[PDB]
């Protein structure tokens, strides 16, 4: 993959939640409830989408819209508080 360890020869690794800190996935703004909000304010609703297309729940944070719950590795690594976390 390219996930390797820094301080190899300490045991154990473990990607585990609560490790990729600053990496919680932004929320998706809802492209289909804006631009309905621009020809409905010429003739901005700005929100995620916290919902699949298929029903499935995208994993908002509940009292952090803009967030999903998802974290991944590349932020919290990229976009991440060095020296702090992954």
């Not at 998706?28 to 916290?50: F, H, M, T």
């Amino acid at each position: 993959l390219g996930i390797r360890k820094r301080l190899p020869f300490q045991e154990g690794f473990q990607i585990m939640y609560e490790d990729l800190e600053g990496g919680n996935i932004p929320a998706l703004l809802d492209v289909a409830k804006y631009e309905a909000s621009i020809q409905k304010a010429k003739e901005l609703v700005i929100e995620p989408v916290a919902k699949d297309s298929k029903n499935r729940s995208y994993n908002l944070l509940p009292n952090d819209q803009n967030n999903t719950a998802y974290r991944s590795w590349f932020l919290a690594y990229n976009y991440g508080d060095p020296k702090k976390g992954v």
